[PDB]
Design a binder for this molecule. Structure first.
Ligand SMILES: [Cl-]
Length: 330
């Protein structure tokens, strides 16, 4: 009987198993160890209630027109889903670095739609009997790689085609029955962008009451993502800018009865844990006041500088940034 907003609130706060099943050609390909139950237990013990499990399917899909997903890969994905589910957390299962075959142009739409139907049909069938703690996310950051608008919310054409892709995925999921008839489903804007036009052009498939919007927002960019940007965050201007961004999401979606999960946020290590914790504390608390649940991007990289978003050392089961983790889960 739960509503989408009740689900989002129950999810509380999440952690991404990044650079893992989303790596290629296999789980260890980008330097992370094979995931264990003990790693996921650490997540639960810290107080997270959601794990997002990004999965890149491309390397595991056979030739058209069957597009068969390798059974051993599905079996491994299910092992990882089970770590999370057996710990009584929400699991988000997606498609991830799949832009090679998911291409949002009118010219590529028919072929991508067909493959999405075949691929989501197999994923959904395998996972159909899980309860509502398993959430499907149709697409990660669907976009045209290399286009000028890739990180600016796309174009009218690509935003239109993404709506068709999300609709195809939702219909395919629901068509498989069992608990997929009522499973909660996350769908992104173009690139999961918070750009005004990306959010304005999103159409919820079938106006389905069990669809949640997925957005990614590593704000503020210069502090959080840019290795050349400032290493300090705090104070009234920084709070005002972030509150403004969260309020735009609240005003567009949440206030109108459309729930939102920020399925990726985070900051890189600039030897600046205090600033990173100040940011996370404000981000998570202000998002929650606006009904929005957040999910930290952890790629297993905790050295200093570019792309080091990891906060758990998976190899020795140690939280590297203990003040930061505590601000995320409080
Ligand atoms: Cl200031």
């Amino acid at each position: 009987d739960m509503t989408s907003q009740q689900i989002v609130n129950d999810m509380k706060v999440g952690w991404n198993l990044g650079n893992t099943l989303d790596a290629s050609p296999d789980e260890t390909g980008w330097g992370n160890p094979k995931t264990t139950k003990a790693m996921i237990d650490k997540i639960k013990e810290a107080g997270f209630n959601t794990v997002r499990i990004p999965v890149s399917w491309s390397s595991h899909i056979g030739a058209g027109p069957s597009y068969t997903i390798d059974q051993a890969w599905l079996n491994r994905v299910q092992e990882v889903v089970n770590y999370v589910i057996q710990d009584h957390m929400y699991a988000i299962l997606n498609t991830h670095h799949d832009t090679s075959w998911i291409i949002p142009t009118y010219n590529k739409e028919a072929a991508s739609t067909d493959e999405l139907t075949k691929v989501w049909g197999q994923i959904a069938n395998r996972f159909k009997d899980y309860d509502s703690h398993l959430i499907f996310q149709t697409l990660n950051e669907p976009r045209i790689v290399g286009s000028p608008e890739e990180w600016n919310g796309g174009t009218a054409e690509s935003r239109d085609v993404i709506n068709k892709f999300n609709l195809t995925a939702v219909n395919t999921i629901r068509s498989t029955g069992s608990n997929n008839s009522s499973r909660f489903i996350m769908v992104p804007t173009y690139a999961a962008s918070t750009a005004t036009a990306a959010m304005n052009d999103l159409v919820i498939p079938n106006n389905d009451k069990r669809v949640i919007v997925s957005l990614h927002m590593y704000a503020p960019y210069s502090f959080a993502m840019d290795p050349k940007g400032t290493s300090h965050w705090g104070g009234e201007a920084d709070k005002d800018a972030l509150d403004g961004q969260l309020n735009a999401i609240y005003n567009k979606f949440v206030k109108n009865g459309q729930p939102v999960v920020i399925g990726q946020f985070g900051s890189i290590n600039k030897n600046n844990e205090s600033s990173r914790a100040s940011l996370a504390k404000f981000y998570v608390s202000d998002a929650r006041k606006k009904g929005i649940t957040t999910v930290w991007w952890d790629n297993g990289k905790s050295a200093v500088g570019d792309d080091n978003y990891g906060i758990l050392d998976r190899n020795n089961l140690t939280w590297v940034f203990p003040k930061l983790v505590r601000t995320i889960v409080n």
